[PDB]
Chain A
Amino acid sequence: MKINKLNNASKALSYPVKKLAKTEKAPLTEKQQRSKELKKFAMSIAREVGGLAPYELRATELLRRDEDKRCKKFMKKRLGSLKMAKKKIELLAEEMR
């Protein structure tokens, strides 16, 4: 059997290359900026025209009573992900302020 002869320490070694730095892409052109602005604008109009959904109302009500941990549990069960819940709570909080 030609397997499992080296230790983990010696398997971790590596050859000394010379690396190339990554080309950063930070510049964003004028036309790309206007494009992003118009999309964010459109998102405002929808919220203005049609308002909040039932679970969003129930959520925001709990935030007024400082029921932070109840709101957390509630949102987790509605959206599934604990990450989506943490994000949606932060967006709702900012809307109320």
Chain B
Amino acid sequence: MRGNQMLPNNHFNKGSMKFKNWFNQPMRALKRKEVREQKSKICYPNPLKKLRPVVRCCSMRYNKKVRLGRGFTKMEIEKAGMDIKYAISVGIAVDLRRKNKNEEGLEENVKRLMDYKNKLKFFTTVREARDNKIEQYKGEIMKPVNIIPEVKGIKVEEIATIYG
């Protein structure tokens, strides 16, 4: 060892070490596409994905950002006038482990349930939908965006009374 370098630390001593290559990457992508397509036929009029709640992220670093969670709580579902068995039949996800501890978090998730209920359409048989030429929705349902906001201006008299 000669000259000036950051002192080495390269961990290649272990003779039993395995290597993983990724030559299969394009092909496995094509298989995942073809499985989704055929799954989408089996339940034609219905979306492939279920509806999920909006929750707030964990640490001090991510407090100001909202995200999708696992499932609605029994309290959210009941407040919007539904019952658990019905919610499942209509493609809403459920999570009985989660607890509610805020007024705000509850109010927002109730809005999602009422919005979704309003945008639905019901059919007697598959053939009726087929004849009406209904086109099935793809991707996640009503996802959050979390954009950067815009700079508001305020009059000099207000400065004393509200502080942004």
Contact surface of A with B, Cβ cutoff 8 Å: 11, 15, 17-20
Contacts and interface: CB of A to CB of B under 8 A. Distances in A.
A15 B63 contact: yes
B64 to A, nearest CB: 9
Interface residues of B, number: 8
A17 B102 contact: yes
A15 B100 CA distance: 17
A52 B6 CA distance: 71
16 contacts: A11-B60, A15-B63, A17-B102, A17-B103, A17-B104, A18-B102, A18-B103, A18-B104, A19-B101, A19-B102, A19-B103, A20-B100, A20-B101, A20-B102, A20-B103, A20-B106
Contacts of A17: 102-104
Nearest to A13: B60
Contacts of A11: 60
A81 B101 CA distance: 36
A15, A17, A20, most chain B CB atoms within 10 A: A20
